[PDB]
Design an enzyme around this catalytic site. Structure first.
Site, PDB file in Angstrom:
ATOM      1  N   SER A 197       0.840  -1.197   0.000  1.00  0.00           N
ATOM      2  CA  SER A 197       0.000   0.000   0.000  1.00  0.00           C
ATOM      3  C   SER A 197       0.879   1.253   0.000  1.00  0.00           C
ATOM      4  CB  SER A 197      -0.946  -0.016   1.206  1.00  0.00           C
ATOM      5  OG  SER A 197      -2.070   0.818   0.968  1.00  0.00           O
ATOM      6  N   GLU A 324      -9.166  -5.216  -3.277  1.00  0.00           N
ATOM      7  CA  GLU A 324      -8.526  -4.091  -2.602  1.00  0.00           C
ATOM      8  C   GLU A 324      -9.490  -3.082  -1.956  1.00  0.00           C
ATOM      9  OE1 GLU A 324      -5.290  -3.840  -2.263  1.00  0.00           O
ATOM     10  OE2 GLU A 324      -4.356  -5.006  -3.870  1.00  0.00           O
ATOM     11  N   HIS A 437      -7.428  -6.023   1.154  1.00  0.00           N
ATOM     12  CA  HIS A 437      -6.269  -5.152   1.070  1.00  0.00           C
ATOM     13  C   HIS A 437      -5.347  -5.513   2.240  1.00  0.00           C
ATOM     14  CE1 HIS A 437      -4.186  -1.438   0.047  1.00  0.00           C
ATOM     15  NE2 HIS A 437      -4.336  -0.954   1.269  1.00  0.00           N
TER      16      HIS A 437
END
Lengths: 532, 532
Positions: A197, A324, A437
């Site tokens: 991320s 995600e 995610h």
């Protein structure tokens, strides 16, 4: 002693730690910068002054000051990401896991945690580098950097709060690794930085920034790229948000000098309590204090840099997760709940679209909605929920990463792309969120190898394959074993654009990862918004 | 005598014609208007003056002056649409097929030929009403109307060439049917007007126009609706094209008086030779002289009329063919040829898109292209060819008809929708063109019942079903037999939007005919073009 190491900054004493019935050395909480406190808040970091005596590196350091998720008190799913150590502005430290016996010159991997640039800790259980260090025989390093206003408050033109200082923290840690990792048995010329991320975006940012390029050999980006819509802002928007922050704390706004001085007098929690009030739009997947295109760390716009090949040319390995977006919808979009199936109505669908693409005019919102709606079954709650999940993920993670990969690959020396779509058998989050995610991280750090954590045998197998892919790539620039008989992860090329799935099933190679949607998000929508 | 009929305009003598081993009466070439010649060219039609003696109605009349397709000399596929009689401005006549023995008061069907408002003849072999009249026992009438500049040259404000005179020709013929069909055994209160393409658009126009509504009971629209992008133009564009026509023939352009006078002095072929030079854009499926929103025949914009329910409320039966666009691409788009598979490159695909949506700005062209492109296989020649075929058909025929049906159904008394997807086994056109624009006509007029034409047994069966659907609808306002055991054609409702396929397979009911694309063509694209 195996636990004693003399670095250029001074001596350090590590500790022996058990791992899968064996042991390795751990050097935790090594300082790489002067504590960025007091008048140093918001400033670029300064090198840690050398020390006499032995630095006790047997325990984890404090975590940087940050917003703390209390949405689900007691729930492991969310609390596993919260700081697990005392928070403090005095938090610029790094950790090193070294195989035993200590190597002479082995491959190094430096982990850069994610957290939307507003949170994150190098000390989370999911980031325990002992499994990867031990299993793949690599020197594993995890650094830390300032987040939130503390690391990204940006008043361009001022030297007291220039912005991007959180990225400079990362860079300083990478500089320390380059200068000292040889004493821990690591090869300073073979370091792979990897992160997820915001961490993945960071990795991409170091590939781009002239001042960071020489500090590492290769890179791995997980669910994030430098060009993500949430990863950076203009100096103008940065300035605007810094000023609004001051306004929330009743600060004198006549000059940068007075604003900065007023902000430095505030306790950490005071800034954190109003951090979220400066966002320009009602939105999801948007964070207050992030990197800024300053003309220094980033010479020009990210797009012009990617277009002219103005970046480090080496090998990269990157990819994304199947779902995600689910995390961000659960936390901020109407209709989604942790304990329900979250079937979404047409009403909430269009509400979610507006929240997901805050910068879009009405025509833009309509374009998105049409692109993700099945008009033969528009009131299908499951289709609307999943459609929204896809929108958030495609716009914020997948499509931006595909744009990066395609632009990078024209000038790079080797690209390897993956699509992680295995949902862990022991996930505590609901089923509707899918392959969440950040949940590929545990497989990368080898948590499935520890029986007590309750993963299946195939998940242990998947974790070993992934760890071996990552480490072999870090070592050679190719995730595949030279003479292996195993299935080969093909190289991603501008022409074929091949990629593989990452799950417990036999390897499957595909092409043009979500091209249909990405052409919409990378070519059409931007053109629409610019013309209208 | 069965062949002698005394009408309000005078006596007429028909002829006996063989049909499927039996016979029926035919009254061909009955005049319904004064010959629109000389100073009458471009003027509204005037009623045919009553005549003494017996009018010989045993032979087909002349066909109106028109452009003649010579693209494939000798080829039956194209020549079957060309005039099969001498052309003449003296062409306002109608034809009637009457069952034998002559009925007392039976259902009447009036056919209005298509041809893009620039061509068409009531005398083509495919329009021979004897099969339908005989088989379903209905009085079949086919009218004629002026086409091209002759029927649609429009200089609004002027009474010498007001425009829409071709539509008034149709109306005058419908007026004659209303006033005289009773003498031929027809019920003037049960007339169904039906037509294909421009004819279908015409039918829809009579439903809309206050002055035509009282002249018929029900309507059938095949592959055409009043709101089609090619079916009408503004008074401004009409004026502009009329002036450009004059410019091509070196006419005095100082006043409407001089332009019109100059045009009336030209031989028919002189106007036809330059007719196509007045189109504003390089395009496909766009015709020079068409109906104009004049504020008279059409009180206001078609869209406002459809929105306020300003139209005749009755039952309607309508539908489209699977591949409406292939004909227009073959004749004017790069890459298409009659004797090749016409696999299209990306180059020609985007060229075709520009030709298909001439009024679109660059953003619009991009939107269309994205909507019809499979990015996982963009260089697939067959996908590009078929994608282009779909674009032409959806934009020009299907989506406009779906907009009409949905708007009409809110105020109507009953809607029946079909999707014709059977490709005739004896078609002479190549396979890539599929179920071609206009090829459902032969099944409606029952040509498959004549063995010598070489259709299969299932196609004869399909033709009988279709003829029976059409005639039963004309008679009752419902295509289904009250107590039949056969499969039922469901009513199209605002909620379910059901429709059926029309082919040789067992009936299949579907819903929301091409909704995905139609939402693009009816809601999104128009919004995009208006904002940008």
């Amino acid at each position: 002693s195996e636990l004693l190491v003399n670095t250029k900054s001074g001596k350090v004493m590590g500790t022996r730690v058990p791992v899968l019935s064996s042991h390795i050395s751990a050097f935790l909480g090594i300082p790489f910068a002067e504590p960025p406190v007091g008048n140093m808040r918001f400033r670029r970091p300064e090198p840690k002054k050398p020390w006499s005596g032995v630095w006790n590196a047997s325990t984890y350091p404090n975590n940087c000051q940050q917003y703390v998720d209390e949405q689900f008190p007691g729930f492991s799913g969310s609390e596993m990401w919260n700081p697990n150590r005392e928070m403090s502005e005095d938090c610029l430290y790094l950790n090193i896991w070294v195989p035993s016996p200590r190597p002479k010159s082995t491959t190094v991997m430096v982990w850069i945690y994610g957290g939307g640039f507003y949170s994150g800790s190098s000390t989370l259980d999911v980031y325990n580098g002992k499994y990867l260090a031990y299993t793949e025989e690599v020197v594993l390093v995890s650094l830390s950097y300032r987040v939130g206003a503390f690391g990204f408050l940006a008043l361009h033109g001022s030297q007291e709060a220039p912005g991007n200082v959180g990225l400079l923290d990362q860079r300083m840690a990478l500089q320390w690794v380059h200068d000292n990792i040889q004493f821990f048995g690591g090869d300073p010329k073979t370091v792979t930085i990897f992160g997820e991320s915001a961490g993945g975006a960071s990795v991409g940012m170091h590939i781009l920034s002239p001042g960071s390029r020489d500090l590492f050999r290769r890179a791995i980006l997980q669910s994030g790229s430098p060009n993500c819509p949430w990863a950076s802002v203009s100096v103008a928007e940065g300035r605007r948000r810094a000023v609004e922050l001051g306004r929330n704390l009743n600060c004198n706004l006549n000059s940068d000098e007075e604003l900065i001085h007023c902000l430095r007098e505030k306790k950490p929690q005071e800034l954190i309590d109003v951090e979220w009030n400066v966002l320009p739009f009602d939105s999801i997947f948007r964070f207050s204090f992030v990197p800024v295109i300053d003309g220094e760390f980033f010479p020009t716009s990210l797009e012009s840099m990617l277009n002219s090949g103005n970046f480090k040319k080496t090998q990269i390995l990157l990819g994304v997760n199947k779902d995600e977006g689910s995390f961000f919808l659960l936390y901020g979009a109407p209709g989604f709940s942790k304990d329900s199936e979250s079937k979404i109505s047409r009403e909430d669908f269009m509400s979610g679209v507006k929240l997901s693409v805050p910068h879009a005019n009405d025509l833009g919102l309509d374009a998105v909605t049409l692109q993700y709606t099945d008009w033969m079954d528009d009131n299908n709650g499951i289709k609307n929920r999943d459609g929204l999940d896809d929108i958030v993920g495609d716009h914020n993670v997948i499509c931006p990463l595909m744009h990066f990969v395609n632009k990078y690959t024209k000038f790079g020396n080797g690209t390897y792309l993956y699509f992680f779509n295995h949902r862990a058998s022991n996930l505590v989050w609901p089923e509707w969120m899918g392959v969440i995610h950040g949940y590929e991280i545990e497989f990368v750090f080898g948590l499935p190898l520890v029986k007590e954590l309750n993963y299946t045998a195939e998940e242990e197998a998947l974790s070993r394959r992934i760890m071996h892919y990552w480490a072999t790539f870090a070592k050679t620039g190719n995730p595949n074993e030279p003479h292996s008989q195993e299935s080969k992860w093909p190289l991603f090329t501008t022409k074929e654009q091949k990629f593989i799935d990452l799950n417990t099933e036999p390897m499957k190679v595909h092409q043009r990862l979500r091209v249909q949607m990405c052409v919409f998000w990378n070519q059409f929508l931007p053109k629409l918004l610019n013309a209208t």
